[PDB]
Design a protein around this ligand. Structure first.
Ligand SMILES: Nc1ncnc2c1ncn2[C@@H]1O[C@H](COP(=O)(O)OP(=O)(O)OP(=O)(O)O)[C@@H](O)[C@H]1O
Ligand SMILES: [Mg+2]
Ligand SMILES: [Zn+2]
Ligand SMILES: [Zn+2]
Lengths: 702, 192
């Protein structure tokens, strides 16, 4: 009913308490969902179906139906929630008679409370009241067992002193023993006691909310018995609970002023995010038959990076991975495709690593500097926030079944270097620190980004003498992507349009395929549970590698080795897995040879690189639409012309043009003979190209 | 839980109340109404009811009263209390007592065996000596000295009786109690 005196004691009194009980039963029985859907019958039904012992009640619905209980709810929530729990138990036991042997206590969680106070604004005015706050979980104890209905032993006569309710406010201490009347020592009977789950979390204000220049404020919250393990350090949550003052923390020890420690007894926790197991393989398989799923997948990675399609092929291959295998038990070969991006600055290497961290499950990010939460090397120490002696296994083993992303790879310690070398050669980490002698597995794919020596990649040198990494470290990578930065007006303009557009559309006041959307992309990559296999075409591979050996010795180059053919096998398995083949088809092998060769050729210094490109164009041009080949040729021609103009005249003549003779000569060099399709190609126009037939000249207007 | 009801005593009480408000004398008026009229007076707390009348009115009632006198006597007194409360303006806390007279059968003092314990009997003897009239505790309200909870209306069984246990369950106090004399009720008591 109403109040004649203070709400807490008014709802404590027997009359109004019983009225509230009956009225809440009436509410739970007679609430419809605006469409005749009786919410609470089905809610109790499914909760009992999966044994959840907790009923979520929307505050909007409670207020709309019965506003007096809703108005009483946040003023004296301890009593009101007690009443609501009793009434919910009654209604459930009425609906399900057999549910008393499941839980015997129903928790009611109040949802959509309108009293949203930020953590910096809780005062002594809010004490003993149901508040709603939001923030970021910064710490979280383990689930602890807390006494709930505690039985004690009289350890003077062994009588078991009957169950006492354990309140959140004080230790229950028995008085006398009922039998022997001793005040003397008791002990918890831990066999007859029933416990409840307990967990402390620290929640601080989201750093975006704290704004003026001031520090974020944090509160402790206590999660009980269903709310435990609903949060995690790093989660952004909505917390509903009683702002609490009175347990045992009051600073009476003259250690200072008589201030009170406060806690929030969490009543409802609501995470702020999406919620990882696939139920529709059917859509994945339908996409698998698309016959162009590979290019869709490649176009679907790092959608917010312009260009860099070779890096995208390599990263997709690594993201799918090959097949680990260990004949007998003595010849381990990894299936992980390690990728090394070495490129001069401002070329989206870190953005690539962040994309991979977003898409990959079990991806962890680390840096060669000291600016990371996790470090490459394992150590054992007392945790700073837990105070708990912990084997702080490194970032290489935290990503055992996933991917380790190492940014600024060339700036590592000697310690970090031996750590990465061990993990990336043995796929294990060997500890010998405190008394701990253990070896623990790091079967990660390493994706790294490095800068060249001197901050600019020099194609006159080999990749090895550009990067500041030893040979053993480089050899343990399958794909080396040289991210070489050059001034190209068309590419510069497309990139500038891209990035300025991103700045436009993210203002606070707001190539041949369509990229497959990232959520079903994640699901598609989860179809790495279909281990696969190959029985195809050893002869062409063997002669390919023999010819590679003969060319690589006939020049003074980094010789091809067995390692490269094994990496090609990994890549072929990965590409076949992209198509969900269950077998490796010849085009998988050809694509793998193309990727392996492109990585191997670009590693070489300029002369050997160019000679190898000439003498392996057959392999290097697989799956190229002959428009890209011509476009590369024409771009090289016009670039040579502009680097002539910029030198003889100091400046370049706009509307640069080149004679058709050079393009047709190069086309005959690569056996095309058909330039009309190129001229009519969309690729031609998108690169701001044009030609005049009567002029016999092909030109670029900028 | 729901305060187990002594159904035999409850039926006996209802039937006794019916006999009280319905039995009539020779002239035709409800005699015990005229007798409970005198019971408004202070220093007046016993209604004397004849057992012959009780047999005449309700035989099963009188037999139950005779056979289980000790367990049903408080209920007979409660019936008398309700019989008088509506008629007149008695103090709320006054206690009324029922006296029976004219039992047709008399027992010998040798015949007062353990089979007669707790059932209505009439004996004859010679008074040898009478002691003084004292107040006797019939139900005391106690204070637990350990937790200060007031245990109320603990019935003395002709012996000074403390609460068995403290009402507070996390206090298993069974020794240290304090009687609150002003909160307790007495009766006049004489031993002869
Ligand atoms: N091709 C591209 N497409 C989209 N954005 C790009 C591209 N190249 C660079 N950027 C932008 O340039 C900025 C610099 O990127 P990033 O920090 O990834 O470079 P980096 O290679 O890590 O440089 P450094 O080697 O100095 O660390 C990023 O904000 C990125 O968005
Ligand atoms: Mg970077
Ligand atoms: Zn004991
Ligand atoms: Zn007590």
């Amino acid at each position: 009913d109403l109040k004649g005196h203070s709400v807490r004691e008014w709802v404590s009194m027997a009359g109004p308490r019983l009225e509230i009980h009956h009225r809440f039963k009436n509410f739970l029985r007679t609430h419809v969902d605006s469409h005749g859907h009786n919410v609470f019958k089905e809610r109790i039904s499914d909760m009992c179906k999966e044994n959840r012992e907790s009923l979520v009640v929307n505050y909007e619905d409670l207020a709309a139906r019965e506003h007096v209980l809703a108005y009483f709810l946040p003023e004296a929530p301890a009593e009101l929630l007690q009443i609501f729990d009793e009434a919910a138990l009654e209604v459930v036991l009425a609906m399900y008679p057999k549910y008393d042997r499941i839980t015997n206590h129903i928790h009611v969680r109040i949802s959509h409370l309108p009293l949203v106070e930020e953590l910096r604004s809780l005062r002594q005015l809010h004490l003993n009241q149901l508040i709603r706050t939001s923030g970021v979980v910064t710490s979280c104890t383990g689930v602890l067992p807390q006494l709930s209905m505690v039985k004690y032993n009289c350890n003077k006569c062994n009588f078991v002193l009957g169950p006492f309710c354990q309140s959140q406010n004080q230790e229950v201490k028995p008085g006398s023993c009922p039998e022997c009347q001793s005040a003397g020592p008791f002990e918890v009977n831990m066999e007859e006691t029933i416990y409840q789950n307990y967990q402390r979390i620290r929640i601080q204000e989201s750093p975006g909310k704290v704004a003026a220049g001031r520090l974020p404020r944090s509160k402790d919250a206590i999660l009980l018995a269903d709310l435990v393990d609903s949060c995690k350090p790093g989660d952004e949550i909505e917390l509903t609970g009683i702002y609490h003052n009175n347990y045992d923390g009051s600073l009476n020890t003259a250690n200072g002023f008589p201030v009170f420690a406060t806690v929030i007894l969490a009543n409802h926790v609501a995470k702020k995010d999406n919620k990882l197991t696939d139920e529709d393989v059917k859509m994945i398989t339908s996409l698998s038959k698309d016959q162009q799923i590979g290019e869709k997948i490649f176009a679907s990675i790092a959608p917010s990076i312009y260009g860099h399609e070779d890096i995208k092929r390599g990263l997709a291959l690594a993201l799918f991975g090959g097949e680990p295998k260990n004949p007998g038990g003595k010849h381990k070969v990894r299936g992980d495709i390690n990728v090394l991006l070495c490129g001069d600055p401002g070329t989206a290497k870190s953005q690539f690593l962040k994309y991979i961290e977003k898409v990959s499950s079990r991806a962890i990010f680390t840096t060669g500097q000291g600016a990371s939460a996790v470090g490459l090397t394992a150590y054992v120490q007392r945790h700073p926030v837990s105070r708990e002696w912990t084997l702080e296994a490194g970032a290489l083993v935290l990503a055992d079944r996933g991917v380790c992303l190492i940014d600024e790879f060339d700036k590592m310690n000697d310690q970090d270097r031996t750590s990465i070398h061990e993990a990336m050669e043995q796929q294990s980490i060997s500890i010998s620190k405190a008394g701990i002698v253990t070896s623990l597995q790091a079967r990660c794919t390493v994706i790294a980004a490095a800068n060249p020596i001197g901050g600019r990649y020099d194609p006159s040198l080999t990749f090895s003498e550009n990067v500041d990494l030893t040979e053993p470290i480089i050899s343990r990578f399958d794909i080396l992507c040289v991210v070489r930065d050059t001034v190209d007006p068309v590419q510069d303009e497309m990139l500038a349009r891209f990035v300025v557009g991103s700045h436009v559309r993210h203002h606070p006041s707001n190539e041949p395929l369509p990229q497959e959307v990232l959520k079903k992309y994640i699901i598609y990559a989860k179809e790495r549970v279909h281990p696969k296999l190959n029985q195809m075409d050893q002869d062409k591979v063997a002669k390919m590698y023999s010819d590679l050996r003969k060319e690589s010795m006939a020049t003074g180059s980094i010789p091809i080795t067995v390692r490269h053919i094994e990496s090609m096998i990994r890549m072929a398995e990965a590409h076949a897995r992209i198509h969900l083949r269950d077998y490796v088809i010849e085009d998988d092998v050809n694509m793998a040879i193309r990727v392996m060769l492109e990585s191997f050729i670009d590693t070489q210094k300029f002369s050997v690189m160019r000679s190898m490109r000439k003498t392996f164009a057959r392999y290097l041009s697989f799956r190229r639409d002959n428009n890209e080949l011509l476009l590369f040729i024409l771009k090289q021609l016009v670039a040579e012309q502009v680097t002539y103009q910029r030198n003889r005249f100091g400046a370049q003549q706009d509307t640069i043009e080149v004679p058709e003779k050079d393009l047709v000569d190069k086309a005959r060099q690569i056996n095309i003979h058909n330039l009309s399709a190129f001229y009519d190609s969309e690729l031609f126009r998108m690169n701001k190209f044009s030609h005049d037939l009567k002029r016999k000249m092909i030109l670029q207007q900028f | 839980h729901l305060e187990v009801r002594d159904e035999v005593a409850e039926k006996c009480q209802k039937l006794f109340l019916d006999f009280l408000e319905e039995f009539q004398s020779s002239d035709g008026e409800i005699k015990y109404l005229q007798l409970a009229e005198e019971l408004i007076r202070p220093e007046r707390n016993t209604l004397v009811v004849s057992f012959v009348d009780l047999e005449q009115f309700n035989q099963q009632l009188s037999t139950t009263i005779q056979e289980e006198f000790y367990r049903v006597y408080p209920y007979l007194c409660r019936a008398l209390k309700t019989f008088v409360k509506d008629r007149k303006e008695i103090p709320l806390a006054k206690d009324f007592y029922v006296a029976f007279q004219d039992l047709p059968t008399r027992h010998k003092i040798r015949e007062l065996t353990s089979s007669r314990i707790g059932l209505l009997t009439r004996i004859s003897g010679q008074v040898v000596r009478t002691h003084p009239v004292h107040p006797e505790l019939v139900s005391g309200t106690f204070l637990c000295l350990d937790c200060q909870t007031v245990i109320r209306d603990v019935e003395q069984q002709f012996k000074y009786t403390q609460p068995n246990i403290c009402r507070n369950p996390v206090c298993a106090n069974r020794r240290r109690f304090l009687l609150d004399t002003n909160k307790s009720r007495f009766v006049d008591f004489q031993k002869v």
